Amino acid sequence: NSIQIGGLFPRGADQEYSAFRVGMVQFSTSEFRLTPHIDNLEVANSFAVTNAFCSQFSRGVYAIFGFYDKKSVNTITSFCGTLHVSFITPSFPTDGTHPFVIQMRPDLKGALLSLIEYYQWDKFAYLYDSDRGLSTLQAVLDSAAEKKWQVTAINVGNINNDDETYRSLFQDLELKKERRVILDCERDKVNDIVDQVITIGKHVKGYHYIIANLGFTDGDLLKIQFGGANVSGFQIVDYDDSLVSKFIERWSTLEEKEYPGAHTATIKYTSALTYDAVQVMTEAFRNLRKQRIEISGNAGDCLANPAVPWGQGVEIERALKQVQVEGLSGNIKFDQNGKRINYTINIMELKTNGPRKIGYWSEVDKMVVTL
Amino acid sequence: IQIGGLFPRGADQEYSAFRVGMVQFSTSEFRLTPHIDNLEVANSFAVTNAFCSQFSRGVYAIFGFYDKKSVNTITSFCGTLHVSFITPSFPTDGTHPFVIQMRPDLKGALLSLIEYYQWDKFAYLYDSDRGLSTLQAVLDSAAEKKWQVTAINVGNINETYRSLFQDLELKKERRVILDCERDKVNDIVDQVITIGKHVKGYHYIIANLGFTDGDLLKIQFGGANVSGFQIVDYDDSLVSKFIERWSTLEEKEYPGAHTATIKYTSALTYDAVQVMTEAFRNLRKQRIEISRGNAGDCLANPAVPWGQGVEIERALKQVQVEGLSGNIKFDQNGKRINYTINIMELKTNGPRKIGYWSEVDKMVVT
């Protein structure tokens, strides 16, 4: 009748949780009910993530949908890989292979290195956070040496008080008259950084910013004041897609009281990846059942040692990774390591009349423009 | 009292060094009861499991190791349950409660060294990872100190070692920093000799704290313009004395315990035993009665009460003793401070201390 799944949600991930439930309803079938048990926790907190996870496993969940960050990812992967429990996640994709983790989020390092070559940049800064990993860094680092680039790669993820040091930033940035900045970092240090360019100095219109994430047109970014600066970014949810359009139809009209974060025209890519994740677990589980593969018994201590992995574990993983569907985030399909493949990333520039889609980037490592 | 002891599999000389010290310090007052585990440190599950089984034993202080992958299991569990962690492992950037970093920090000395040699353009070889914050430190400085840095995370290494040096002749820039594991070093080293002309006009800086510890003279170098770092001075009575017993130990009772020198992490391990000892000796002295075990399941029971944990962490951080790594003193976060790092250059007579970097200031010629 019903399947047990976990939900590990970060403190205050309202919209994502709303999109999750909106998914539970949308792909629900008479066939079976997904029965989630949600924990809200500090994801940066490894202990608390361990506890949340262990709590789920002790309760016999087959699959956990949740989030991690740089500080807790190894906990997720090690425990998932040990107990043979599957984590479906909108969080940043791990470098290197990892069993039992299913990555809803397409990598972006490639589209990005292409965007750089496209604008034929050769001298620029890459101002980074470590918070969604630093595998991207390694990539710009490798190509700079390979494709002969001079790059000023600063981890600006070190902030305190002294905005004396913040003006120091751009102060030094003009040492070579760069003007070309890639921003790979949280939204706060994006606003703060650019705000420094505007307030403290000139010439504002002179810079071109590449915003290194997949939610250019998620509402927040284009709220900041760039001046007349060129501003480029990425988008993974195509609001011109029919599948997306019908979704925002109902979404834009949900009650905000009943569904925190909804009742809006856009949707953050992480919430879109959440919705899609529910379709994905859903399909996986119907593929299992179709093969009459029993979900299923004890599953006690996760710190049980020696540990025993559910026997049905590699099957469920198998089912998840073999899923192929279209979602809010385009073509959804995974390689053997649970990574997104055959996806498209839209390439965006901000213009007087809004974000325009100047092209896209195919996981066949190709950047294609539009007329 | 009862202090856990987590070692990575087959870290023998480190574990033996633990023994030597455990003895050479367990005089008069009390012997510590080390519960030992040999874990796969990269495995955060393993580590969660070791750490917790200690917490069960009622251990107040764990000595041990972590790596890039398990360091957060450690820090999060330590600070949550209020159990002190003493380690020779890489010093985290960023502050963390209930952690005592025995290992001095190398970023500063390195950055000072590069300046000393007036390098403005140079390569960097960053095998992942002894905490790659070093390559960061350098890239954050390159911006200010105007440096052209060709960064190459030699963490992959699948052959293309020849394309590396070869491509680094495009600019004919022949200055290189090697930041990685001992294994990667030797391997990328002999590759400068083969398919590498010229392998002489090159200057190599080895970014670790064991310049002598390992295979230095075990390489022709070619150039062989070489610099690096040692935190252990074998011209130091304290070290010498120690070595005289270390050169004279049975290698079967104590694997890796019979050589003229010793890896800096084993030395750090040794100093940790002394540090942990001086700490409890001082609690007992001031009549603070610690107690007091059988704490249940780390996931379902409460942490050592805060007021007690502090007592011990504070005791560990207040320690100020002379050791193999030199003057050992910690700050409120448990970072080493007021330490000194010897700057080695390679020579024909052998390696020689040419200078020292002081944590109180920067580098100076001897």
From Swiss-Prot, chain A:
PTM statement from Swiss-Prot or TrEMBL: Palmitoylated. Depalmitoylated upon L-glutamate stimulation. Ubiquitinated by RNF167, leading to its degradation.
Induction cue: Down-regulated in the pyramidal cell layer of CA1 in the hippocampus by global ischemia.
Tissues and organs where the protein is expressed, per its UniProt entry: Detected in forebrain. Detected in dendrites of neuronal cells. Expressed in the pyramidal cell layers of CA1 and CA3 and in the granule cell layer of the dentate gyrus.
Extracellular side: 1-371
Top-level lineage group: Eukaryota
Residues bearing glycans: 230, 342
Location relative to the cell: Cell membrane; Postsynaptic cell membrane; Postsynaptic density membrane
Paired cysteines (S-S): 54-302
Domain notes: The M4 transmembrane segment mediates tetramerization and is required for cell surface expression.
Assembly information from the UniProt record: Homotetramer or heterotetramer of pore-forming glutamate receptor subunits. Tetramers may be formed by the dimerization of dimers. May interact with MPP4. Forms a ternary complex with GRIP1 and CSPG4. Interacts with ATAD1 in an ATP-dependent manner. ATAD1-catalyzed ATP hydrolysis disrupts binding to ATAD1 and to GRIP1 and leads to AMPAR complex disassembly. Interacts with GRIP2. Interacts with GRIP1. Interacts with NSF via its C-terminus. Interacts with CACNG2, PICK1 and GRIP2. Interacts with GRIA1 and SYNDIG1. Part of a complex containing GRIA2, NSF and NAPA and/or NAPB.
Miscellaneous: The postsynaptic actions of L-glutamate are mediated by a variety of receptors that are named according to their selective agonists. This receptor binds AMPA (quisqualate) > L-glutamate > kainate.
Sequence similarity: Belongs to the glutamate-gated ion channel (TC 1.A.10.1) family. GRIA2 subfamily.
Function in brief: Ionotropic glutamate receptor that functions as a ligand-gated cation channel, gated by L-glutamate and glutamatergic agonists such as alpha-amino-3-hydroxy-5-methyl-4-isoxazolepropionic acid (AMPA), quisqualic acid, and kainic acid. L-glutamate acts as an excitatory neurotransmitter at many synapses in the central nervous system and plays an important role in fast excitatory synaptic transmission.
Name assigned to this protein: Glutamate receptor 2
UniProtKB/Swiss-Prot annotation, chain B:
Extracellular side stretches: 1-366
Induction notes from the record: Down-regulated in the pyramidal cell layer of CA1 in the hippocampus by global ischemia.
Further details from the record: The postsynaptic actions of L-glutamate are mediated by a variety of receptors that are named according to their selective agonists. This receptor binds AMPA (quisqualate) > L-glutamate > kainate.
Organism lineage: Eukaryota, Metazoa, Chordata, Craniata, Vertebrata
Comment field on protein domains: The M4 transmembrane segment mediates tetramerization and is required for cell surface expression.
Protein name: Glutamate receptor 2
Organism: Rattus norvegicus
Gene assigned in the entry: Gria2
Tissue expression: Detected in forebrain. Detected in dendrites of neuronal cells. Expressed in the pyramidal cell layers of CA1 and CA3 and in the granule cell layer of the dentate gyrus.
Disulfide cross-links: 52-298
Functional note: Ionotropic glutamate receptor that functions as a ligand-gated cation channel, gated by L-glutamate and glutamatergic agonists such as alpha-amino-3-hydroxy-5-methyl-4-isoxazolepropionic acid (AMPA), quisqualic acid, and kainic acid. L-glutamate acts as an excitatory neurotransmitter at many synapses in the central nervous system and plays an important role in fast excitatory synaptic transmission.
PTM entry text: Palmitoylated. Depalmitoylated upon L-glutamate stimulation. Ubiquitinated by RNF167, leading to its degradation.
Location within or outside the cell: Cell membrane; Postsynaptic cell membrane; Postsynaptic density membrane
Glycosylation sites: 225, 338
Source domain of life: Eukaryota
Quaternary data: Homotetramer or heterotetramer of pore-forming glutamate receptor subunits. Tetramers may be formed by the dimerization of dimers. May interact with MPP4. Forms a ternary complex with GRIP1 and CSPG4. Interacts with ATAD1 in an ATP-dependent manner. ATAD1-catalyzed ATP hydrolysis disrupts binding to ATAD1 and to GRIP1 and leads to AMPAR complex disassembly. Interacts with GRIP2. Interacts with GRIP1. Interacts with NSF via its C-terminus. Interacts with CACNG2, PICK1 and GRIP2. Interacts with GRIA1 and SYNDIG1. Part of a complex containing GRIA2, NSF and NAPA and/or NAPB.
Family: Belongs to the glutamate-gated ion channel (TC 1.A.10.1) family. GRIA2 subfamily.
